[PDB]
Amino acid sequence: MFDLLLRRARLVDDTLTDIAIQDGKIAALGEISAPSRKTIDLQGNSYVSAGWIDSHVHCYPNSPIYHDEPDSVGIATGVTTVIDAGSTGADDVDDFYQLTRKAVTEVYALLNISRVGLIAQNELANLANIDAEAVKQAVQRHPDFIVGLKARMSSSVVGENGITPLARAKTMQQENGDLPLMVHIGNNPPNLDEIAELLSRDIITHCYNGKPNRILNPAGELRSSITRALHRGVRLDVGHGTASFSFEVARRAIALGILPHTISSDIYCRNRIDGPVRSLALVMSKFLAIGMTLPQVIDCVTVSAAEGLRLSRKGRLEAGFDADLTLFRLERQPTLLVDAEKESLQADNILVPLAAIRAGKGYLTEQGSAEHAFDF
Ligand SMILES: [Zn+2]
Ligand SMILES: [Zn+2]
């Protein structure tokens, strides 16, 4: 007998289907007649996808500048897994882990290659903080919480070390079971060519920034280093953020056939409440407005995100996987979407998350409670 049954759900290809959940796992999809302890009829008026994954957040509550609560950036916005993008290094990762034990959202962390994390804005300026043994110990200590490494390779972070930290990060990668490595880009030095040459089958975030280390050359074409990196299997993550997303860069790259592998927000409390990010749903909506299809955007926050961070039981609406689901609507609601270059774009439709299902347990969002429709 099922724990939860969603009837007449709409998949992102617009087909109607039923989704049965048993013991925190997806039990079945399709036409379902077996009994359930709880049944919800979505009446064809809400999409259901695998639980959204935000591959680039800052949800360490004690981080001095880029802080947020995991559940404020997770379930409250329909997102069932968040991945902290190196807010902590080895110095603060234990406290981070202990605080996240209570979160309803599934929280994983990318470990900053610098021991001090985002305690300071120049964490790669001192090579002594880029400590391999500290990271080895941290990884051994939290083998399931830490899912990869973070290196912010830009001018204000490396100080006078240039490209040397990325080399270290690569070495560090090798020493820890070849964990995924997320590389932030923006201002130079180092140059984009030098950074991308060091990467291999690795994730470049802020992939549509309008800073000098943008993936487009001044002629409006893709940098050849980025073409070869993509050839080698390097992936692009959006990591919108406060200053890392340009509508014009993204439009041009998307016209060149260079779509993001994953969409992510680079969200923290300030750009959620005040800044141009607001939520993963709104970032996704910006990519819908640029012209990507709904299946593509949803893939960018589910199966592709789970593959890129090796989250084996997340991101897939398949029998036997974790019962993390997002229930949402594409609502006609004229809205101004603002990028990091302060450029506005009028959009007619936006994604509105209505509920997050986590381990088979439902949680309405604010909008989900307002619209009523269904309850858990
Ligand atoms: Zn960054
Ligand atoms: Zn970030």
Tab-separated table of C-alpha atoms and ligand atoms in Angstrom:
chain	number	residue	atom	x	y	z
A	1	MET	CA	0.000	0.000	0.000
A	2	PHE	CA	1.579	3.293	-1.107
A	3	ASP	CA	2.644	6.047	1.268
A	4	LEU	CA	1.790	8.788	-1.212
A	5	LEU	CA	0.114	8.820	-4.631
A	6	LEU	CA	0.003	11.783	-7.014
A	7	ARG	CA	-2.710	11.351	-9.628
A	8	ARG	CA	-2.998	13.271	-12.900
A	9	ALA	CA	0.353	14.980	-12.499
A	10	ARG	CA	1.780	16.672	-15.562
A	11	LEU	CA	5.299	15.842	-16.643
A	12	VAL	CA	7.377	18.518	-18.358
A	13	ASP	CA	6.555	16.981	-21.733
A	14	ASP	CA	2.905	17.824	-20.796
A	15	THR	CA	1.720	14.220	-20.505
A	16	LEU	CA	-0.542	13.171	-17.638
A	17	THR	CA	0.669	10.449	-15.304
A	18	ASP	CA	0.509	9.033	-11.777
A	19	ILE	CA	3.451	8.864	-9.350
A	20	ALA	CA	3.487	6.410	-6.429
A	21	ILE	CA	5.870	6.822	-3.479
A	22	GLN	CA	6.644	4.128	-0.919
A	23	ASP	CA	9.179	4.216	1.925
A	24	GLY	CA	10.860	7.439	0.834
A	25	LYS	CA	11.482	6.129	-2.709
A	26	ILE	CA	9.707	6.498	-6.024
A	27	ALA	CA	7.673	3.303	-6.270
A	28	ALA	CA	6.067	3.615	-9.687
A	29	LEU	CA	5.120	5.932	-12.546
A	30	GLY	CA	2.327	5.550	-15.066
A	31	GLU	CA	-1.286	4.401	-14.797
A	32	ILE	CA	-1.665	3.268	-11.179
A	33	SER	CA	-4.620	1.551	-9.495
A	34	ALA	CA	-2.967	0.110	-6.356
A	35	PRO	CA	-4.089	1.660	-3.041
A	36	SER	CA	-2.335	4.477	-1.197
A	37	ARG	CA	-2.513	5.853	2.333
A	38	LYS	CA	-2.698	9.366	0.862
A	39	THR	CA	-3.728	10.420	-2.632
A	40	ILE	CA	-3.503	13.885	-4.200
A	41	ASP	CA	-5.250	14.753	-7.469
A	42	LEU	CA	-3.234	17.460	-9.242
A	43	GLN	CA	-6.018	17.811	-11.872
A	44	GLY	CA	-3.567	18.412	-14.700
A	45	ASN	CA	-2.849	21.874	-13.263
A	46	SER	CA	0.656	21.355	-11.840
A	47	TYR	CA	3.904	20.001	-13.203
A	48	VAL	CA	5.856	17.439	-11.199
A	49	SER	CA	9.546	16.831	-11.750
A	50	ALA	CA	12.367	15.229	-9.843
A	51	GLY	CA	13.261	17.420	-6.873
A	52	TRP	CA	15.179	20.451	-8.110
A	53	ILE	CA	18.895	20.534	-7.328
A	54	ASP	CA	20.684	23.887	-6.938
A	55	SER	CA	24.361	23.127	-7.624
A	56	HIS	CA	25.655	26.511	-6.410
A	57	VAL	CA	24.325	28.090	-3.207
A	58	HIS	CA	25.763	29.669	-0.073
A	59	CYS	CA	23.800	28.314	2.863
A	60	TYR	CA	26.345	28.310	5.701
A	61	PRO	CA	24.515	30.402	8.339
A	62	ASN	CA	27.747	31.523	10.023
A	63	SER	CA	29.525	32.766	6.879
A	64	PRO	CA	30.203	36.497	7.435
A	65	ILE	CA	29.058	37.793	3.998
A	66	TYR	CA	27.496	35.046	1.849
A	67	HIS	CA	25.218	33.269	4.307
A	68	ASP	CA	21.737	31.786	4.211
A	69	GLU	CA	19.673	29.048	5.845
A	70	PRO	CA	19.571	25.751	3.901
A	71	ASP	CA	15.798	25.556	4.116
A	72	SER	CA	15.381	29.179	3.007
A	73	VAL	CA	17.209	28.309	-0.234
A	74	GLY	CA	15.903	24.736	-0.370
A	75	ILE	CA	12.393	23.392	0.322
A	76	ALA	CA	10.934	26.859	0.855
A	77	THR	CA	11.598	27.490	-2.867
A	78	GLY	CA	10.789	23.960	-4.050
A	79	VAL	CA	14.456	22.890	-4.149
A	80	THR	CA	15.105	19.513	-2.524
A	81	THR	CA	18.922	19.410	-2.700
A	82	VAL	CA	21.315	22.352	-2.395
A	83	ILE	CA	25.090	22.241	-2.900
A	84	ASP	CA	27.085	24.853	-0.990
A	85	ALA	CA	29.755	26.187	-3.331
A	86	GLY	CA	32.742	26.355	-1.041
A	87	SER	CA	31.476	28.674	1.704
A	88	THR	CA	33.582	26.577	4.105
A	89	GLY	CA	36.994	25.027	3.901
A	90	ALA	CA	38.371	22.515	6.372
A	91	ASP	CA	38.283	25.155	9.125
A	92	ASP	CA	34.481	25.468	9.288
A	93	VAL	CA	33.169	22.364	7.507
A	94	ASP	CA	32.466	20.445	10.734
A	95	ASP	CA	30.249	23.201	12.157
A	96	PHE	CA	28.525	23.494	8.779
A	97	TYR	CA	27.804	19.739	8.772
A	98	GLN	CA	26.478	19.800	12.345
A	99	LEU	CA	24.142	22.724	11.669
A	100	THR	CA	22.820	21.141	8.464
A	101	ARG	CA	21.967	17.856	10.209
A	102	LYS	CA	18.576	19.396	11.072
A	103	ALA	CA	17.729	20.809	7.619
A	104	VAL	CA	14.790	19.341	5.743
A	105	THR	CA	16.653	20.142	2.521
A	106	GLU	CA	19.326	17.672	1.479
A	107	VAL	CA	22.544	19.665	1.897
A	108	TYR	CA	25.882	18.781	0.338
A	109	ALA	CA	28.990	20.917	0.243
A	110	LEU	CA	31.789	21.677	-2.143
A	111	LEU	CA	34.883	22.129	0.026
A	112	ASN	CA	36.803	25.323	-0.676
A	113	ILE	CA	40.402	24.497	-1.521
A	114	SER	CA	41.350	27.265	0.923
A	115	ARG	CA	41.136	26.197	4.566
A	116	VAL	CA	39.431	29.453	5.613
A	117	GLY	CA	36.586	29.279	3.064
A	118	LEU	CA	34.584	32.455	2.478
A	119	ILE	CA	35.515	33.853	5.908
A	120	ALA	CA	37.463	36.384	3.815
A	121	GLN	CA	36.968	37.562	0.233
A	122	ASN	CA	40.622	36.837	-0.684
A	123	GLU	CA	40.854	33.214	0.441
A	124	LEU	CA	43.389	32.174	-2.235
A	125	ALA	CA	45.725	35.140	-1.619
A	126	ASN	CA	47.737	33.152	0.936
A	127	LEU	CA	49.119	29.894	-0.438
A	128	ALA	CA	49.462	28.548	3.116
A	129	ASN	CA	45.658	28.384	3.358
A	130	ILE	CA	45.480	26.171	0.253
A	131	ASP	CA	46.416	23.151	2.363
A	132	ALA	CA	46.172	19.656	0.892
A	133	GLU	CA	46.330	17.728	4.180
A	134	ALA	CA	43.523	19.775	5.743
A	135	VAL	CA	41.300	18.957	2.779
A	136	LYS	CA	42.253	15.276	2.813
A	137	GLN	CA	41.341	15.125	6.504
A	138	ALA	CA	38.078	17.012	5.937
A	139	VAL	CA	37.093	14.669	3.093
A	140	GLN	CA	37.866	11.592	5.179
A	141	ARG	CA	35.818	13.108	8.015
A	142	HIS	CA	32.688	13.796	5.910
A	143	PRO	CA	32.814	11.376	2.964
A	144	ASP	CA	29.129	11.777	2.095
A	145	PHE	CA	28.609	15.469	2.919
A	146	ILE	CA	31.479	16.804	0.781
A	147	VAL	CA	30.714	16.110	-2.888
A	148	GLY	CA	33.533	18.073	-4.531
A	149	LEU	CA	35.923	21.018	-4.420
A	150	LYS	CA	35.545	24.745	-5.074
A	151	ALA	CA	38.149	27.121	-6.477
A	152	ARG	CA	37.310	30.798	-7.091
A	153	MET	CA	39.854	31.691	-9.758
A	154	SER	CA	39.602	35.455	-10.189
A	155	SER	CA	41.683	38.543	-9.509
A	156	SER	CA	40.328	39.535	-6.072
A	157	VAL	CA	40.702	35.948	-4.760
A	158	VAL	CA	44.122	34.685	-5.877
A	159	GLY	CA	45.992	37.882	-5.041
A	160	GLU	CA	49.453	37.459	-6.563
A	161	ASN	CA	49.230	33.684	-7.065
A	162	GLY	CA	47.572	33.771	-10.491
A	163	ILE	CA	47.016	30.255	-11.838
A	164	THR	CA	48.858	28.392	-9.061
A	165	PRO	CA	45.764	27.648	-6.885
A	166	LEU	CA	44.003	25.804	-9.728
A	167	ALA	CA	47.040	23.565	-10.164
A	168	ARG	CA	46.782	22.852	-6.438
A	169	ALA	CA	43.044	22.216	-6.738
A	170	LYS	CA	43.730	19.702	-9.497
A	171	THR	CA	46.320	17.908	-7.371
A	172	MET	CA	43.820	18.030	-4.528
A	173	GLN	CA	41.187	16.499	-6.787
A	174	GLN	CA	43.486	13.583	-7.603
A	175	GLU	CA	44.188	12.922	-3.945
A	176	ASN	CA	40.496	12.605	-3.007
A	177	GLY	CA	39.016	9.993	-5.322
A	178	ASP	CA	38.733	12.415	-8.267
A	179	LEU	CA	35.975	14.498	-6.705
A	180	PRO	CA	34.288	16.987	-9.056
A	181	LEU	CA	35.904	20.431	-9.071
A	182	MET	CA	33.915	23.656	-9.491
A	183	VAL	CA	35.896	26.630	-10.804
A	184	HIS	CA	34.531	30.155	-10.535
A	185	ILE	CA	35.493	32.635	-13.266
A	186	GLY	CA	35.086	36.383	-13.614
A	187	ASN	CA	37.866	38.959	-13.557
A	188	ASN	CA	41.416	38.374	-14.793
A	189	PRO	CA	44.210	37.544	-14.009
A	190	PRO	CA	44.386	34.593	-14.437
A	191	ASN	CA	43.194	34.471	-18.044
A	192	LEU	CA	40.366	32.183	-19.168
A	193	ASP	CA	42.718	30.306	-21.505
A	194	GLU	CA	45.092	29.307	-18.702
A	195	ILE	CA	42.209	28.258	-16.434
A	196	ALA	CA	40.361	26.211	-19.054
A	197	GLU	CA	43.527	24.461	-20.230
A	198	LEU	CA	43.889	22.887	-16.764
A	199	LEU	CA	40.340	21.454	-16.710
A	200	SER	CA	39.059	18.085	-17.909
A	201	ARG	CA	36.056	15.738	-17.724
A	202	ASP	CA	35.281	19.708	-13.874
A	203	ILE	CA	32.641	22.462	-13.879
A	204	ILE	CA	33.048	26.129	-14.784
A	205	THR	CA	30.478	28.187	-12.906
A	206	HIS	CA	29.387	31.780	-13.651
A	207	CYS	CA	29.511	30.523	-17.222
A	208	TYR	CA	27.604	33.506	-18.666
A	209	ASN	CA	29.379	36.293	-16.773
A	210	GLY	CA	30.008	39.549	-18.620
A	211	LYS	CA	33.436	40.112	-17.033
A	212	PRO	CA	36.691	39.926	-19.051
A	213	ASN	CA	36.967	36.146	-18.485
A	214	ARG	CA	33.691	35.567	-20.326
A	215	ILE	CA	33.395	32.528	-22.582
A	216	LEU	CA	32.869	34.729	-25.678
A	217	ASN	CA	35.686	36.586	-27.434
A	218	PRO	CA	35.220	40.255	-28.411
A	219	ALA	CA	34.033	39.152	-31.864
A	220	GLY	CA	31.016	37.426	-30.291
A	221	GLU	CA	32.296	33.878	-30.846
A	222	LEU	CA	33.169	31.153	-28.374
A	223	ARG	CA	36.727	31.147	-27.099
A	224	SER	CA	38.639	28.249	-28.620
A	225	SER	CA	39.842	27.272	-25.141
A	226	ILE	CA	36.211	26.845	-24.084
A	227	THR	CA	35.478	24.820	-27.230
A	228	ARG	CA	38.338	22.414	-26.481
A	229	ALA	CA	37.329	22.250	-22.805
A	230	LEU	CA	33.789	21.257	-23.794
A	231	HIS	CA	35.367	18.718	-26.158
A	232	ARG	CA	37.213	17.213	-23.168
A	233	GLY	CA	34.017	17.007	-21.078
A	234	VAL	CA	34.171	20.187	-18.986
A	235	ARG	CA	30.683	21.411	-18.079
A	236	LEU	CA	29.175	24.882	-17.734
A	237	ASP	CA	27.188	25.884	-14.640
A	238	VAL	CA	25.281	29.167	-14.577
A	239	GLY	CA	25.804	30.311	-10.976
A	240	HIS	CA	23.776	33.496	-11.602
A	241	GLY	CA	24.793	35.401	-8.481
A	242	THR	CA	24.881	39.132	-7.943
A	243	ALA	CA	27.465	39.942	-10.629
A	244	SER	CA	27.912	36.712	-12.641
A	245	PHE	CA	25.052	36.583	-15.193
A	246	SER	CA	24.642	38.674	-18.352
A	247	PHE	CA	21.471	38.346	-20.440
A	248	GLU	CA	23.410	39.417	-23.540
A	249	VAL	CA	26.240	36.922	-23.006
A	250	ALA	CA	23.718	34.151	-22.377
A	251	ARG	CA	21.611	35.014	-25.436
A	252	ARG	CA	24.685	35.019	-27.659
A	253	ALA	CA	26.114	31.768	-26.270
A	254	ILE	CA	22.704	30.084	-26.570
A	255	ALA	CA	22.498	31.233	-30.203
A	256	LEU	CA	25.902	29.615	-30.752
A	257	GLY	CA	24.500	26.315	-29.478
A	258	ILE	CA	26.312	26.624	-26.145
A	259	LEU	CA	23.609	25.776	-23.595
A	260	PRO	CA	24.321	25.393	-19.873
A	261	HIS	CA	24.799	21.901	-18.566
A	262	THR	CA	23.357	22.973	-15.205
A	263	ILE	CA	21.408	26.024	-14.068
A	264	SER	CA	22.239	27.290	-10.587
A	265	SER	CA	21.574	30.463	-8.649
A	266	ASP	CA	24.680	31.440	-6.632
A	267	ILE	CA	22.094	32.468	-4.068
A	268	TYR	CA	22.627	33.835	-0.588
A	269	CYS	CA	20.420	35.834	1.738
A	270	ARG	CA	21.083	39.240	0.156
A	271	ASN	CA	20.544	38.431	-3.510
A	272	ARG	CA	17.592	36.234	-2.545
A	273	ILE	CA	15.803	38.974	-0.607
A	274	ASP	CA	17.151	42.011	-2.526
A	275	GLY	CA	19.412	41.036	-5.419
A	276	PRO	CA	18.779	39.835	-8.959
A	277	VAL	CA	18.728	36.114	-8.076
A	278	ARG	CA	15.604	35.759	-5.871
A	279	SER	CA	15.214	31.983	-6.397
A	280	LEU	CA	16.277	29.099	-8.604
A	281	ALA	CA	12.784	29.229	-10.106
A	282	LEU	CA	13.374	32.813	-11.279
A	283	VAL	CA	16.806	32.002	-12.750
A	284	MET	CA	15.265	29.047	-14.606
A	285	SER	CA	12.539	31.410	-15.823
A	286	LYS	CA	15.194	33.708	-17.286
A	287	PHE	CA	16.461	30.801	-19.350
A	288	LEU	CA	12.902	30.034	-20.485
A	289	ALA	CA	12.666	33.678	-21.585
A	290	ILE	CA	15.911	33.408	-23.566
A	291	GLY	CA	14.333	30.496	-25.435
A	292	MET	CA	15.265	27.178	-23.841
A	293	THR	CA	12.430	24.662	-23.578
A	294	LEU	CA	10.945	23.605	-20.261
A	295	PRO	CA	12.416	20.052	-20.533
A	296	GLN	CA	15.878	21.589	-21.041
A	297	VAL	CA	15.655	23.900	-18.019
A	298	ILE	CA	14.279	21.097	-15.835
A	299	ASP	CA	17.080	18.793	-17.010
A	300	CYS	CA	19.527	21.542	-16.051
A	301	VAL	CA	18.252	21.402	-12.466
A	302	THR	CA	17.614	17.644	-12.131
A	303	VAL	CA	19.296	14.856	-14.110
A	304	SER	CA	22.205	17.014	-15.316
A	305	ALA	CA	22.853	18.469	-11.871
A	306	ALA	CA	22.770	15.017	-10.285
A	307	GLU	CA	25.100	13.594	-12.942
A	308	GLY	CA	27.564	16.475	-12.665
A	309	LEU	CA	27.942	16.064	-8.898
A	310	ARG	CA	27.535	12.242	-8.923
A	311	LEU	CA	24.383	12.333	-6.756
A	312	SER	CA	23.489	8.769	-7.626
A	313	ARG	CA	19.905	8.565	-6.295
A	314	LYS	CA	18.834	12.176	-6.942
A	315	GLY	CA	17.625	14.038	-10.015
A	316	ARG	CA	15.679	11.233	-11.716
A	317	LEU	CA	11.926	10.602	-11.847
A	318	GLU	CA	12.456	6.838	-11.965
A	319	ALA	CA	11.319	3.901	-9.867
A	320	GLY	CA	13.638	3.176	-6.962
A	321	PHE	CA	15.249	6.605	-6.774
A	322	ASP	CA	14.813	8.969	-3.832
A	323	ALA	CA	11.309	10.402	-3.486
A	324	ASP	CA	12.436	14.007	-3.958
A	325	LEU	CA	9.930	15.842	-6.161
A	326	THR	CA	9.134	19.437	-7.080
A	327	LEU	CA	5.540	20.500	-7.798
A	328	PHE	CA	5.357	23.744	-9.727
A	329	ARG	CA	3.366	25.782	-12.230
A	330	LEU	CA	4.194	27.870	-15.294
A	331	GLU	CA	1.972	30.855	-14.582
A	332	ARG	CA	1.219	33.750	-16.903
A	333	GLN	CA	2.420	36.641	-14.734
A	334	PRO	CA	4.199	39.580	-16.432
A	335	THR	CA	7.504	40.033	-14.600
A	336	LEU	CA	10.754	41.963	-15.024
A	337	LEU	CA	13.793	39.678	-14.836
A	338	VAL	CA	17.014	41.545	-13.999
A	339	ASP	CA	20.483	40.151	-14.670
A	340	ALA	CA	23.821	41.047	-13.070
A	341	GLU	CA	24.496	43.862	-15.573
A	342	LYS	CA	21.297	45.614	-14.372
A	343	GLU	CA	19.601	44.764	-17.693
A	344	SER	CA	15.851	44.150	-17.554
A	345	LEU	CA	13.846	41.639	-19.579
A	346	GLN	CA	10.057	41.455	-19.637
A	347	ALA	CA	8.771	37.884	-19.356
A	348	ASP	CA	5.179	36.699	-19.609
A	349	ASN	CA	5.595	33.363	-17.790
A	350	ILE	CA	7.487	32.381	-14.645
A	351	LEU	CA	7.948	29.108	-12.798
A	352	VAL	CA	6.083	29.118	-9.477
A	353	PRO	CA	7.128	26.326	-7.083
A	354	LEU	CA	4.106	25.014	-5.195
A	355	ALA	CA	5.567	22.217	-3.097
A	356	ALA	CA	8.697	20.226	-2.350
A	357	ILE	CA	8.511	16.508	-1.588
A	358	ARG	CA	11.527	15.320	0.369
A	359	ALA	CA	12.022	11.644	1.240
A	360	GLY	CA	8.330	11.196	0.423
A	361	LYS	CA	7.125	13.983	2.748
A	362	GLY	CA	5.394	17.025	1.265
A	363	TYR	CA	5.980	20.687	2.167
A	364	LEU	CA	3.930	23.466	0.575
A	365	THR	CA	5.782	26.630	-0.363
A	366	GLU	CA	4.337	30.035	0.471
A	367	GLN	CA	2.738	30.195	-2.992
A	368	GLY	CA	1.534	26.605	-2.629
A	369	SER	CA	-0.242	27.486	0.606
A	370	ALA	CA	-1.694	30.653	-0.948
A	371	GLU	CA	-3.115	28.848	-3.992
A	372	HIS	CA	-4.304	26.027	-1.671
A	373	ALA	CA	-5.115	23.410	-4.349
A	374	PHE	CA	-3.700	20.538	-2.288
A	375	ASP	CA	-2.275	19.764	1.139
A	376	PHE	CA	-0.110	17.034	2.638
B	1	ZN	ZN	31.792	32.714	-7.409
B	2	ZN	ZN	29.184	31.461	-5.202
